[PDB]
Design an enzyme around this catalytic site. Structure first.
Site, short mmCIF file in Angstrom:
data_model
loop_
_atom_site.label_atom_id
_atom_site.label_comp_id
_atom_site.label_asym_id
_atom_site.label_seq_id
_atom_site.Cartn_x
_atom_site.Cartn_y
_atom_site.Cartn_z
N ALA A 34 0.85 -1.20 0.00
CA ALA A 34 0.00 0.00 0.00
C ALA A 34 0.90 1.26 0.00
O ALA A 34 0.57 2.25 -0.61
CB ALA A 34 -0.93 0.00 1.18
N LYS A 82 -7.69 -6.58 5.57
CA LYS A 82 -7.69 -6.40 7.05
C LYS A 82 -8.42 -5.10 7.41
O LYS A 82 -8.60 -4.18 6.54
CB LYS A 82 -6.27 -6.37 7.54
CG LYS A 82 -5.50 -5.14 7.05
CD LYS A 82 -4.04 -5.13 7.47
CE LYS A 82 -3.23 -6.26 6.83
NZ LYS A 82 -1.87 -6.24 7.45
CL LIG Z 1 -0.72 -0.02 5.64
#
Ligand SMILES: [Cl-]
Ligand SMILES: [Cl-]
Ligand SMILES: [Cl-]
EC number: 3.2.2.-
Length: 151
Positions: A34, A82
């Site tokens: 990310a 998540k």
């Molecule tokens: Cl992250």
């Protein structure tokens, strides 16, 4: 001519229509894949932050950013693995995400896409099982070239 290939290299260079970024639901792109996406794709990051503020980014609910019809990659598929960035990736969340990945590919008529190993490897989820779930999900896509970058 749909096809699943498992490759090594820089996901961000994949010469495809759509990239998958593995994200959390709290609006942070601080580490791992990310982080690379935040740096490479700032407009996606800002859009993602706003989508998280709205509660739009959830498990099993990919947030897609369209960079425009002349762009490559055109789409960033922000795939939650998540809830919070400190939590591990979870297999259930990858399973629900892969179902939605198929949905978004079909909705958007995406013909090529590249993915990271969805939280597998390097202390994360077990890659054999993640690879198996990716195969199950993404070999049922007609006409789509899928590139999966190995851990
Ligand atoms: Cl992250
Ligand atoms: Cl990456
Ligand atoms: Cl962008």
């Amino acid at each position: 001519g749909g096809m699943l290939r498992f490759v090594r290299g820089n996901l961000l260079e994949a010469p495809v229509e759509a990239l998958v970024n593995t994200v959390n639901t709290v609006g942070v792109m601080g580490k791992g894949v990310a982080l690379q996406f935040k740096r490479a794709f700032p407009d996606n990051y800002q859009a993602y932050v706003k989508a998280c503020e709205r509660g739009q980014v959830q498990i099993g609910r990919i947030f897609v950013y369209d960079r425009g019809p002349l762009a490559q990659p055109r789409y960033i598929f922000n795939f939650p693995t998540k809830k919070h960035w400190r939590h591990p990736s979870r297999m259930e969340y990858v399973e629900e995400g892969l179902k939605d990945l198929v949905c978004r590919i079909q909705e958007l008529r995406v013909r090529s896409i590249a993915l990271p190993p969805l939280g597998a490897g390097n202390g994360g989820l077990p890659w054999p099982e993640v690879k198996q779930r990716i195969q199950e999900a993404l070999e049922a896509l007609e006409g789509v070239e899928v590139w999966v970058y190995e851990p």
